[PDB]
Design a protein around this nucleic acid. Structure first.
Lengths: 100, 116, 65, 271, 65, 88
RNA sequence: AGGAGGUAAAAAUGCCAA
RNA sequence: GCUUGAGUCUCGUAGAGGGGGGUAGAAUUCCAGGUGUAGCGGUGAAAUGCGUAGAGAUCUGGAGGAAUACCGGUGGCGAAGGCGGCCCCCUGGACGAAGACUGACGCUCAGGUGCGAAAGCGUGGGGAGCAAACAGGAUUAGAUACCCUGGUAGUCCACGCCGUAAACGAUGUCGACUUGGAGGUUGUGCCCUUGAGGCGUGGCUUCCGGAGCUAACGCGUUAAGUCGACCGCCUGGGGAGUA
């Protein structure tokens, strides 16, 4: 299909409840037969500028491949989730796993 | 009259005039002085010497608070940029650091077409 | 912007203003944009820099100084 | 869509009408109809209270739903129906158990679109939820003031309300007048804006087209006699009387807001 | 003279800011290519990686936050 | 896009073989596959005048080939347009 | 060799032909 | 018939090409307040204006619109007009290498049709900033101007219309041929990648300059050189691109 390089920051209070979210998204794509290749967790790291006056947040890295239907509903799950702040999706540019 | 150790000086050196203000660490304005109130009017108000004597009228009226060490914030090019800091390196104030907060935009809010 | 020169500096040492922009830049953004003169005043300034190069290796002029 | 007509006759010249192919072209759904006694603007004493009203053409009240109490029950839009009582258009909906009901139409609503209400519903125009599950900055319509009363705001044709901010136990709404108002955060609101946005573009065209809307000819005050209006009289269209109502109260800028019971909720006066 | 990954092949990445902080300045702006000596291909590719990394707050915009 | 999957069925359906990607009948079937395809693209936009010019080249490229084929090989010319449903 | 900042209050007209 | 002109297909590269939908920071203005005190603002100077009803300066918070610093460059792209934060979706066009195919399918173009900056016009939204008109202050012999303070249309968005510009490398389009040099940009091959390479081979672009040409200035392999094919137009200045 097409690869996508997803990052999304989440609210640092919901890092207590973060890994159950990641299994919903990874079963959304793998249930739609798209594969994942990375699952890199950057963790609770310090920001450089205060997004919503909030300091340090938690970062997730995906680097997955999926058909274009799965990402559009994925954006809405990132749109309506006040645990998640400032998500991002990029285009194919064929992917493999590295780069901590 | 409430004494304080650490203050902050805001220096606003606009082209026509420079207005200095010494505040606290939390933005509550302790006192201020300006180059229009320092006797000079117009042309003489546009002078680095008028800027240096403006902070000397702000060197007092902060003596009720007794600030020893202070930060310095500058904004605006003016003539008053590298003059009022020399109005405090003689006036006995431990300058911790000097920063600059000149409001550079990122290309918004179109400027005027000023004088031809 | 930010300078400390940490403990015994005793004097301004403020190279940092012309080191990046902050004197020269807002005496440019402060007025008329023209939308066109930015193409025009880049034309001659780039024309001058090639004329600056035109006399660099053409320094083989004698004049008997 | 919005069409213009060709000047075959004077009165057919300036007429512009909206026409809509997806409107149901038959009888309305019979058991959701009552009658409605047209009054002519008179009340139980029998005097004219609101002037310039009366006549036109018979109508039939369609009981629309406003409360949207069916929760956890998906439903299916049957067809978009014309409604002469509203200014919007309505939709006959079929709930999954079998009930048929009338709701206002969101603008992005085709026949066959599946909606749901309650609290479990998703953000999709046609759904109703209590406004703390609705994310801040959304566009809702048909929102009620009291928690469960009905819906009174943004229910005319092509109107909407932007949710400004959720202030804990309350929520701030900017109405269509340009007025920011607090409502209780546990009120229902239907997502998306009302359809029939081209109602604004409609021009009647002839005097009789106003008549069958039920209105009557407004006589302007300066033609009446001085016993009949505060203006009026003279010898050739005089004036000079600081324009008022027919009961001698200043119009053209004179505020009549005197409530004192809802100033708890009005954040900013409209402008 | 002192160029970069043109023979050291890269696909310049916006996540590893350790190489990205070399080509920003101390004030938080993107350095010109004419001083760093990078090629025009691998300097447009990196300024894209800066504005990406500015969006994730890995690098500031200037300081005023 | 008219993908490598999409075109490979068209060159097999019309060519002398799969290596015959150059014929007049192959190119016209490539154009009408794409001219019909962008009719969905040029409905919602209707104001993208830039990429519309690339369609008008694909139209005019098709028109010049049919006038060549009609001048050349009339039996296949009246074979193609009823295999495609075009020409007015 | 490279580079930065600063630098004018208004001020009109003079016949026709040689 | 044929392949060298045109065209297709395969693998890829580069890009402010276009349309649509999101999204982010800096800044201005505004709104509510905290601290705080007499000016601020502007200018050649001043005044109008603003401010003790508490401004301006400063701090926190909120709203709103518009534009995208740095990168950024006689850099890239597009037929031209034009196009600049970032992300997605739909989508045009160019280019490169080694092969394959069709077989002159080509060039140009009156009328015709399409696109076409800015300003205008229409409807419905939007309105921070900026600013025709307009008002006030100065200036001046006068100043219905520059300058100052304001400030509506307008600029913004969606959809129609207008169809003009110093719409300009003031240079129609296509092809072939004829010394060089220094760069920019984007491919690609080979060689020792052995290090910012070495030698080529393509596309595009900037400057200089020879023969030649030109009234001269200057153009000068991207011609204004040497020719070929079509098209547009000119015939003293005004009157007039007007009736």
């Amino acid at each position: 299909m097409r690869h996508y390089e997803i990052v999304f920051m989440v609210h640092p209070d919901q890092s207590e409840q973060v890994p159950g979210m990641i299994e919903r998204y990874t079963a959304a794509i793998t249930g739609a037969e798209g594969k994942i290749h990375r699952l890199e967790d950057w963790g609770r790291r310090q920001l450089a500028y205060p997004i919503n006056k909030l300091h340090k947040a938690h970062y997730v890295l995906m680097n997955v491949e999926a058909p274009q239907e799965v990402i559009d509903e994925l954006e809405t799950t990132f749109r309506f989730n006040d645990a998640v702040i400032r998500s991002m999706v990029m285009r194919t540019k064929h992917a493999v796993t590295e780069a901590s | 009259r409430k004494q304080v150790s650490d203050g902050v000086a805001h220096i606003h050196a606009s082209f026509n005039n420079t207005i200095v203000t010494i505040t606290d660490r939390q933005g509550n304005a302790l006192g201020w002085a300006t180059a229009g109130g320092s006797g000079f009017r117009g042309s003489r108000k546009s002078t680095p010497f008028a800027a240096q004597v403006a902070a000397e009228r702000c060197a007092d009226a902060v003596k009720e608070y007794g600030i020893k060490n202070l930060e310095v914030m500058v904004k605006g090019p003016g003539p008053g940029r590298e003059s009022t800091i020399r109005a405090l390196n003689a006036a006995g104030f431990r300058i911790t650091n000097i920063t600059d907060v000149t409001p550079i935009p990122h290309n918004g809010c179109r400027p005027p077409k000023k004088r031809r | 912007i930010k300078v400390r020169e940490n403990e015994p500096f005793d004097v301004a040492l403020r190279r940092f203003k012309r080191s990046c922009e902050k004197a020269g830049v807002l005496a440019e953004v402060r007025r008329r944009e023209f939308y066109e003169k930015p193409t025009t005043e880049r034309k001659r300034a780039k024309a001058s820099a090639v004329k600056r190069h035109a006399k660099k290796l053409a320094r083989e002029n004698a004049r008997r100084t | 869509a919005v069409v213009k007509c060709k000047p075959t006759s004077p009165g057919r010249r300036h007429v512009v009408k909206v026409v809509n192919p997806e409107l149901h072209k038959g009888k309305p759904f019979a058991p959701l109809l009552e009658k409605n006694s047209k009054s002519g603007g008179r009340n139980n004493n029998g005097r004219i209270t609101t002037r310039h009203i009366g006549g036109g053409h018979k109508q039939a009240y369609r009981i629309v739903d406003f409360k949207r109490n069916k929760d956890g029950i998906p439903a299916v839009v049957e067809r978009l129906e014309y409604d002469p009582n509203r200014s919007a258009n309505i939709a006959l909906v079929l709930y999954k158990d079998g009930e048929r009901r009338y709701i206002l139409a969101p603008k992005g609503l085709k026949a066959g679109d599946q909606i749901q209400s309650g609290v479990d519903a998703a953000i999709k125009p046609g759904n109703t939820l209590p406004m703390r599950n609705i994310p801040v900055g959304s566009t809702v319509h048909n929102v009620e003031m009291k928690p469960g009363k009905g819906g009174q705001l943004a229910r005319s044709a092509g109107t909407y309300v932007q949710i400004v901010a959720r202030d804990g136990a309350y929520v701030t709404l900017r109405l269509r007048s340009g007025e920011m108002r607090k409502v209780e955060a546990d009120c229902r609101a239907t997502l998306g804006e009302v359809g029939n946005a081209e109602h604004m573009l409609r021009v009647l065209g002839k005097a009789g087209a106003a008549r069958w809307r039920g209105v009557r000819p407004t006589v302007r005050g300066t033609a009446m006699n001085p016993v009949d209006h505060p203006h009026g009289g003279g010898e050739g269209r005089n004036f000079g009387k600081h324009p008022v109502t027919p009961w001698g109260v200043q119009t053209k800028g004179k505020k009549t807001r005197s409530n004192k019971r809802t100033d708890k909720f009005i954040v900013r006066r409209r402008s | 003279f002192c160029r970069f990954t043109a023979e050291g092949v890269q696909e310049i990445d916006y996540k590893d800011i350790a190489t990205l902080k070399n080509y920003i300045t101390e004030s938080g702006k993107i350095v010109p290519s004419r001083i760093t000596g990078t090629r025009a291909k691998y300097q447009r590719q990196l300024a894209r990686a800066i504005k990406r990394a500015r969006y994730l707050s890995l690098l500031p915009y200037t300081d005023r936050h | 896009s008219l993908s490598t999957e999409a075109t490979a069925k068209i060159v097999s359906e019309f060519g002398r073989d799969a290596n015959d990607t150059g014929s007049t009948e192959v190119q016209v079937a490539l154009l009408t596959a794409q001219i019909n395809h962008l009719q969905g693209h040029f409905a919602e936009h209707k104001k993208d005048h830039h990429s519309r010019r690339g369609l008008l080249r694909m139209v005019s490229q098709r028109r010049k080939l049919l006038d060549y084929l009609k001048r050349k090989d009339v039996a296949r010319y009246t074979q193609l347009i009823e295999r495609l449903g075009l020409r007015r």
